[PDB]
Paper text:
KIF1A, a key member of the kinesin-3 family, is recognized for its high processivity and fast MT plus-end-directed motility. These attributes are crucial for the long-distance transport of cargoes in neurons. Mutations in the microtubule-associated motor protein KIF1A lead to severe neurological conditions known as KIF1A-associated neurological disorders (KAND). Here, we present 2.7-3.5 Å resolution structures of dimeric microtubule-bound KIF1A, including the pathogenic P305L mutant, across various nucleotide states.
To test whether the presence of a proline residue at the end of the KIF1A neck-linker affects its structure and KIF1A processivity we created a KIF1A variant by replacing the conserved proline residue with leucine (P364L). This substitution mirrors the residue found at the corresponding position in human KIF5B (L335) and in other kinesins. We then assessed the velocity and run-length of this variant and determined its two-heads-bound structure. Interestingly, the P364L mutation did not affect the motor’s velocity. However, it resulted in a modest but significant reduction in run length (from a median length of 14.6 µm to 10.2 µm), highlighting the crucial role of the proline residue in KIF1A’s superprocessivity. The structural analysis of the P364L mutant revealed a neck-linker length similar to that of the wild-type (WT). Nonetheless, replacing the proline likely increases conformational entropy in the substitution zone. Subtle variations in the neck-linker path and the orientation of the trailing motor domain are visible in the mutant. Such structural deviations hint at diminished interhead-tension in the P364L mutant, allowing a part of the trailing motor domain to shift slightly backward. Furthermore, our mutagenesis studies indicate that altering KIF1A’s neck-linker —by substituting the proline at the end of the neck-linker with the equivalent residue in kinesin-1— markedly reduces the motor’s run length.
Author numbering:
A (entry chain K): 4 to 389
B (entry chain B): 1 to 432
C (entry chain E): 1 to 451
D (entry chain A): 152 to 440
The structure:
């Protein structure tokens, strides 16, 4: 289960249009090309990704990737892969003001609804449609942030304290005392989602009027149950959906941060550098390994260096299917930063995950043994041996 | 100005701190009564690093004394420098942890931590520009380990910017004095690697070896061990207090010695050590200092550095000397011992020089090593930890105080992640 | 203020307490009359320590003791003895018959109507005390009031106080020597109470003390005075940590932490190394290595059991006098290098060490020699089960025919109590056998890399 | 910060930098490559002429010439002070050929981004060795070009001499300077780029050098400082560059930098910049055809 990688280029804003307004991103098929304005004579270096989105011209229909198109292309089959049972992850990436929140959250007041709202609509529509006497569904939700190496709850009411991070020996890292709440209607989870977005810490900077000062993870856990007393069991399947909105890398000179803003940017940069190190590794490791064929030596990826990578240990690697979405600023001024994103985005393609469904071995061992008995009995009786 | 707040926890920490304050007062010419009777003018140039000036031209150390047994406090007060400390900073309780980390961290220490933090806040707010904290204690003990970890976590929450140092005495392979040392050591190492910037590892076995072999002491006691640790403590902070041709702050050492955030465990050492009656034969010079510096037997952590590689080392010299000589000596040490330094950090040797040697020595120096071999200690502790956690040897005494097997399991897992991290840069062969 | 309360129950406990209080009075310089000429001569000090003695405004010092017994005679000796003025006038004597070597009589019939008065004074002392450290209960197995009344008192103390440490010093029946026919019944009956309620029980055997007196001390005809003095020296070494300064001081909570791996295996042996006469005091060095080696000798054990037949679960050494950690470390290493001393694989450390500066004192008219160094060792091992096994055997030989049972059942008990006590003792022996087993044979499943 | 703000405020005024470059081998910190490579933008955009001195070069000069077996920073600082005094003596004392800072900069920077000349001082000699040697003009002029006497660990014979400026102090006559320059041009080990037929600038000052009390330099009637723009310095920059890569592959010591507001990508940007300066020193060499 390789990590899917998608890239998306946004249109200009006030800052770039006031200054020089020349784009540098070209997009065609599954290829994205970035040119150097300072070295126009050099080769137009291009990178290949699975999915490429050109949101430059909204009203035009020439390869315009609306949010409906984006969701149908990435969130739809990610939601499907959740429906078999695999734990699924989405995570955003790029430099500041690139449009990570716009891709994930979007504007709740318009048809341009981000990934999270439309995944919510598809989930609720499907579970309402597919409800049956035996088939039944349960959905439970949570939403937390990492501000400055401190986990905070957003759906919870005002709690000045910081939640603790623990490590279950079998289930890996998790957050203790997280106000994880239930849902029975789309309107309820919309209300929880609005509350979480309001609770998020946001500050204004030169690069973005509403800049994310913290990382955030929206976490759904979805249980499918079989209410058949004859043969089936309850909680027969469980899946975990983890949608991650990361803060962008910042430069002090361009951002103009001072005091608390500068410290917040520094901490976000530390976390992003650690995550890049993990990505490079994850990618680099697979690389080395396959490149030849094998030889053991799994080395070690610094997951404890930051809380962000520690909490997302299972999502970056192991038991999960993960998708990266990268946001590009088309302006020439951001070129180097954009290149860096694309470079790390390329490495994100090389990561391989060991995805498993889950089931429940306590009962699936019994079911498998009974099925084996049935198969052997059928073979013996059909062949006249039994 | 850059001034340090000193904290002492547990019996071992209190003893080492008492000897350390004796050494510092002798260095700065502070009398036991608090008055100044020095000779050089540089002694009072930077007295405010470690002291606060009182009304009557006296100087009080900026120490905070912490324990859960009045006996140690009475021992410090009934001593040569008992009157130097401020009486209000003697924070203590009763019914000590009794070699139980859970009591020290959760049950008993949770009540005295508020008073200790109040005193810490009052002392820190009076500073002009605080630099950091340094805490002295033992990891294998009771109240010391638990309340030290608790105070470290609380202060790190309060003051994230300032540098944190710790002088930790840890268990040994042979020298064992309490039965539950692995449990306390494991939990202390978990809290330490979580929430510190520097941590100097001290060992009783190594100090005893230095006393028997180097110093030729027939009957060493805890006084000599505290003397050695105090010499190292003074050497680490010599540069803040006196001028030098090439200065070096604690922050500079932290930047130059910590390549990655979780690798902040250090092996200290000191030179010269002569044993008395052999000073006339030995010739004191920078080559001799360096040769004693990089000897395997001079380390205080009970690790053989030749069983690994040096990630990065730092030498701080004190006394008048030539920079060409010290630079050349460090270069020869790197070149001759080529197989004991990582090949991806060219010139992994920090050098600092100060012009004010100790009172009775023409030249002195201290050494701070960061090498992979330290992994052995952690590995050893882990083995012993397993040997008791498999059967739950003494576990109930902890679980009665509000603990669970999950906390122990994650502590052991974190130690395993640490030892794997260190082991990564041991094998040679790698890269362009 | 490390303050403990010493309770003495039964004749054995009372005589032990007499010897112990003689020793503490000699150690702290308090005269029999109760006054303290040392402070008057010097000017003042903390030698009138709160750990055993409480001071009043007149300069008098009273012990924190509670003597209890049903026979008037044993403590009527104390009231008319040398130390009449030392103790409080109250001495808690039932002017009635004795328990008559009957657990039921001492627990159910006559133990009542006195347990109240006793508990009330055990309070007037606790309330007077501040920062109470624990209780030290002295008694003897095989006795009526030494088995039943102690059981009732420990039950009520556990109900009332609960979390305070309750150390128990007791005398077990010997394998061969005995002074009563119904000792096995009482000793087996009280096993439930000393298992459930006591936090740590130190046990001694009279035959071992007689052997030590005969061989080491060259006393051909010892009496109870010498054994009581030895037990007093043991208790003094135990409690010396919380009275005097030392390089490494060990409180009672640390004893419980180190010597008790699990709740039900709190039965450590004890021993004293430099038991030696004045004539043999010469021609000997009495170095740290010598006393440390002597602590582990099978002959010097104070209970007739062989440590070589079992494995050591934990050890705790308390040194007194001119001792420096280099020699105790070297001695511990030397002991670890020996093959005969086997340690459980699941306790790699296996040693607790404490050092104190105050040397042991010599009782005038005694028999122990003055020494510069001493050590008291506590040793939690699996060999003790052997002794218990012997006792268990005796019980069956007396319970197969229900001999001497009509006396017990005539005071309140039934045969179900006997059966329950025997089953509980068997369960304890099974637990001791199980815990001494090695750790699972290396669970080397030999997993090849990833599953 | 200071160079940037000075460039914004004043701008037109000349800005001379005297800096201690990291040595090939010995140094007193493990993070020197990061700071040195990050300072490339400062030393290249805002500074009009940057001089670099290596500590090992001055150590070798002190050992060999002055016979000081155990030199310290005082001697290095005194030598640097003598260099700066030789540079600035024209603005103070009368002379036959006075060299102002403007004309000094004009004839030593052929192009804007190659303003990194080496420096050397000829009459570095002890009191004992001051005797037995004439110390004539030709001797000092030849001694300037020796690789042994250079103040940076870089061999001039591995590159080409782009430009040179000789500033004499003391009893010096133009005839001897012309003869020495002709003799140097006759020598073939010293290679000059074809597009600079003149090559040499000459300045003379009457004031002889002074001797600090308690110093090591002997009293000499004559002295000269040679300041030469050459392509060999690129090698001195490449060695350090290698170190940076060996420290940047694994992102060692990066968390300290990025925890103080700096972005990760600035390292790579500085690396590409320094890569450029190197290529340019390579391009400017290739002779014309
Ligand atoms: C012949 C001579 O010169 O006397 C020396 C001496 O003999 C030797 C052996 C000294 C001596 O040290 C010891 O014997 C010793 C014993 C146990 C542990 C440590 C030391 C000396 O005691 C130690 C003492 O050291 C100092 O005064 C330092 O300044 C030292 N001071 C203290 O530790 C100190 C002592 C009492 C009160 C307060 C401070 C110091 C070192 C580093 C940083 C600060 C202070 C000196 C000069 C000597 C004697 C007296 C014999 C040595 O000590 C030091 C570190 O100076 C041990 O090896 C060194 C080298 C010396 O040659
Ligand atoms: N070491 C020692 N043991 C004693 C002493 N006195 C009695 N014992 C032991 O006590 C046991 C008999 O039970 P006791 O506890 O004395 O009986 P008691 O205390 O008089 O109580 P009752 O039997 O009800 O009268 C014997 O086996 C003795 O070994 C003594 O002074 N020293
Ligand atoms: N295709 C687009 N069309 C219109 N507006 C867009 C588009 N992409 C982004 N924006 C706007 O650009 C702004 C910045 O987007 P946003 O997603 O909030 O930045 P970000 O990803 O959160 N970076 P950060 O500052 O770290 O939070 C928002 O006001 C978006 O509405
Ligand atoms: N170097 C040194 N170590 C000591 C001293 N006192 C105790 N220790 C060590 O501390 C450990 C016991 O921890 P302890 O101080 O009792 O823990 P605490 O009760 O919580 O303070 C032992 O392993 C000793 O080796 C001392 O004076 N010097
Ligand atoms: Mg955002
Ligand atoms: Mg009796």
């Amino acid at each position: 289960a390789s990590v899917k990688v998608a890239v998306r280029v946004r249109p200009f804003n006030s800052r770039e249009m006031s200054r020089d307004s020349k784009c540098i991103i070209q997009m065609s098929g599954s290829t994205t090309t970035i040119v150097n304005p300072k070295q126009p004579k050099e080769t137009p270096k291009s990178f290949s990704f699975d999915y490429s989105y050109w949101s430059h011209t909204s009203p035009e229909d020439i390869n315009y990737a609306s949010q409906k198109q984006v969701y149908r292309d990435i969130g739809e089959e990610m939601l499907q892969h959740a429906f078999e049972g695999y734990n699924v992850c989405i995570f955003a990436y790029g430099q500041t003001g690139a449009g990570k929140s716009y891709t994930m959250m979007g504007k709740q007041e318009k048809d341009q609804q981000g990934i999270i709202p439309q995944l919510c609509e598809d989930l609720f529509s499907r579970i309402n449609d597919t409800t049956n006497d035996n088939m039944s569904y349960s959905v439970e939700v949570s939403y937390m942030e990492i501000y400055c190496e401190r986990v905070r709850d957003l759906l919870n009411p005002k709690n000045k304290g910081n939640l603790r991070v623990r490590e279950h020996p079998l289930l890996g890292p998790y957050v203790e005392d997280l106000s994880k709440l239930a849902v029975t209607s789309y309107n309820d989870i919309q209300d929880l989602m609005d509350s979480g977005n309001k609770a998020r810490t946001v500050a204004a900077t030169n690069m973005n009027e509403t800049s994310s000062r913290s990382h955030a993870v929206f976490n759904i856990i979805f249980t499918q149950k079989r209410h058949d007393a004859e043969t089936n069991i309850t909680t027969e399947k469980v899946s975990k959906i983890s949608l991650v909105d990361l803060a962008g890398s910042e430069r002090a000179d361009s951002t103009g941060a001072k005091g608390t803003r500068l410290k917040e940017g520094a901490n976000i940069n530390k976390s992003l550098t650690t995550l890049g190190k993990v990505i490079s590794a994850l990618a680099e490791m697979d690389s080395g390994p396959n490149k030849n064929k094998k030889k053991k030596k799994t080395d070690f990826i610094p997951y404890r260096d930051s809380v962000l990578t520690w909490l997302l240990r299972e999502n970056l690697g192991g038991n999960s299917r993960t998708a990266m979405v990268a946001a590009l600023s088309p302006a020439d001024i951001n070129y180097d930063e954009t290149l860096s994103t694309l470079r790390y985005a390329d490495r994100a393609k090389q990561i391989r995950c060991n995805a498993v469904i889950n089931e429940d071995l306590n009962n699936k061992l019994i079911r498998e043994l009974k099925d084996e008995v049935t198969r052997l009995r059928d073979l013996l009786y059909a062949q006249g041996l039994g | 100005m850059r001034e340090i707040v000193h904290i002492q926890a547990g019996q071992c920490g209190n003893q080492i701190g008492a000897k350390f304050w004796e050494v510092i007062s002798d260095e700065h010419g502070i009398d036991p009564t608090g008055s100044y009777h020095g000779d050089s003018d540089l002694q009072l140039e930077r007295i405010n690093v470690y002291y606060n000036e009182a009304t009557g031209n006296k100087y009080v150390p900026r120490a905070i004394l912490v324990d859960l047994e009045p006996g140690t406090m009475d021992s410090v007060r009934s001593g040569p420098f008992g009157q130097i400390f401020r009486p209000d900073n003697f924070v203590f309780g009763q019914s000590g942890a009794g070699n139980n980390w859970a009591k020290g961290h959760y049950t008993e220490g949770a009540e005295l931590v508020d008073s200790v933090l109040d005193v810490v806040r009052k002392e820190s707010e009076s500073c002009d520009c605080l630099q950091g904290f340094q805490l002295t204690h033992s990891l294998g003990g009771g109240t010391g380990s638990g309340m030290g970890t608790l105070l470290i976590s609380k202060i790190r929450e309060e003051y994230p910017d300032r540098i944190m140092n710790t002088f930790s005495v840890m268990p040994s392979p042979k020298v064992s004095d309490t039965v539950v040392e692995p449990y306390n050591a494991t939990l202390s190492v978990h809290q330490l690697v979580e929430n510190t910037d520097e941590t100097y590892c001290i060992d009783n076995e190594a100090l005893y070896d230095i006393c028997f072999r180097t110093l030729k002491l027939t009957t060493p006691t805890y006084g000599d061990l505290n003397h050695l640790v105090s010499a190292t403590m003074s050497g680490v902070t010599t540069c803040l207090r006196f001028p030098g041709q090439l200065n070096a702050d604690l922050r500079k050492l932290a930047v130059n010695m910590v390549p990655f955030p979780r690798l902040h465990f250090f092996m200290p050492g000191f030179a010269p050590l002569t044993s008395r009656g052999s000073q006339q034969y030995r010739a004191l010079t920078v080559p001799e200092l360096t040769q004693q510096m990089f000897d395997s037997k001079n380390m205080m952590a009970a690790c053989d550095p030749r069983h690994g590689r040096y990630l990065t080392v730092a030498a701080i010299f004190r006394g008048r000397m030539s920079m060409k000589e010290v630079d050349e000596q460090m270069l020869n040490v790197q070149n001759k011992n080529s197989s004991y330094f990582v090949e991806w950090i060219p010139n992994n040797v920090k050098t600092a020089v100060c012009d004010i040697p100790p009172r009775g020595l023409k030249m002195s120096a201290t050494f701070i090593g960061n090498s992979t071999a330290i992994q052995e200690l952690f590995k050893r502790i882990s083995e012993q930890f397993t040997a008791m956690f498999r059967r739950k040897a003494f576990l109930h005494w902890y679980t009665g105080e509000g603990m669970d097997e999950m906390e122990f399991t994650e502590a052991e897992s974190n130690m395993n992640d640490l030892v794997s991290e260190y082991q990564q840069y041991q094998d040679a062969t790698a890269d362009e | 203020m490390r303050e403990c309360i010493s309770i003495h129950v039964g004749q054995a406990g009372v005589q032990i307490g007499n010897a112990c209080w003689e020793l503490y009075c000699l150690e702290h310089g308090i005269q029999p009359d109760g006054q303290m000429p040392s402070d008057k001569t010097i000017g003042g000090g903390d030698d009138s320590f709160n750990t055993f003695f409480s001071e009043t405004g007149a300069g008098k010092h009273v012990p924190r003791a509670v003597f209890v017994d049903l026979e008037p005679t044993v403590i009527d000796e104390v009231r008319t003895g040398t130390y009449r003025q030392l103790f409080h006038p109250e001495q808690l004597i039932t002017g009635k018959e004795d328990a008559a070597n009957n657990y039921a009589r001492g627990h159910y019939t006559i133990g009542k109507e006195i347990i109240d008065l006793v508990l009330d004074r055990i309070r007037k002392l606790a309330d007077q005390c501040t920062g109470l450290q624990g209780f030290l209960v002295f008694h003897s197995f095989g006795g009526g009031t030494g088995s039943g009344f102690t059981s009732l008192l420990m039950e009520r103390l556990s109900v009332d106080y609960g979390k305070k440490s309750k150390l128990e010093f007791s005398i077990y029946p010997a394998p061969q020597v005995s002074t009563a026919v119904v000792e096995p019944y009482n000793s087996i009956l009280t096993t439930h109470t000393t298992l459930e309620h006591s936090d740590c029980a130190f046990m001694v055997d009279n035959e071992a003390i007689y052997d030590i007196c005969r061989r080491n001390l060259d006393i051909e005809r010892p009496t109870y005075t010498n054994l009581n003095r030895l037990i007093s020296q043991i208790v003094s070494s135990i409690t010396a940590s919380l009275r005097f300064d030392g390089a490494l001081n060990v409180d009672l909570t640390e004893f419980q932490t180190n010597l008790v791996p699990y709740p039900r295996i709190h039965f450590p042996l004890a021993t004293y190394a430099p038991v030696i006469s004045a004539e043999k005091a010469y021609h000997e060095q009495l170095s740290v290595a010598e006393i440390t080696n002597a602590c582990f000798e099978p002959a010097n054990q104070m209970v007739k059991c062989d440590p070589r037949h079992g494995k050591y679960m934990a050890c705790c050494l308390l040194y007194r006098g001119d001792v420096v950690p280099k020699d105790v470390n070297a001695a511990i290493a030397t002991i670890k290098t020996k093959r005969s001393i086997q340690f459980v694989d699941w306790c790699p450390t296996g040693f607790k060490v404490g050092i104190n500066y105050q040397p042991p004192t010599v009782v005038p008219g005694g028999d122990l020699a003055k020494v510069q160094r001493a050590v008291c060792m506590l040793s939690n091992t699996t060999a003790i089960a052997e002794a218990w096994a012997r006792l268990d055997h005796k019980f069956d030989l007396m319970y197969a025919k229900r001999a001497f049972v009509h006396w017990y059942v005539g005071e309140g008990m039934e045969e179900g109590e006997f059966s329950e006590a025997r089953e509980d003792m068997a369960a304890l022996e099974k637990d001791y056998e199980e815990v001494g087993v090695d750790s699972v044979e290396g669970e080397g499943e030999e997993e090849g890399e990833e599953y």
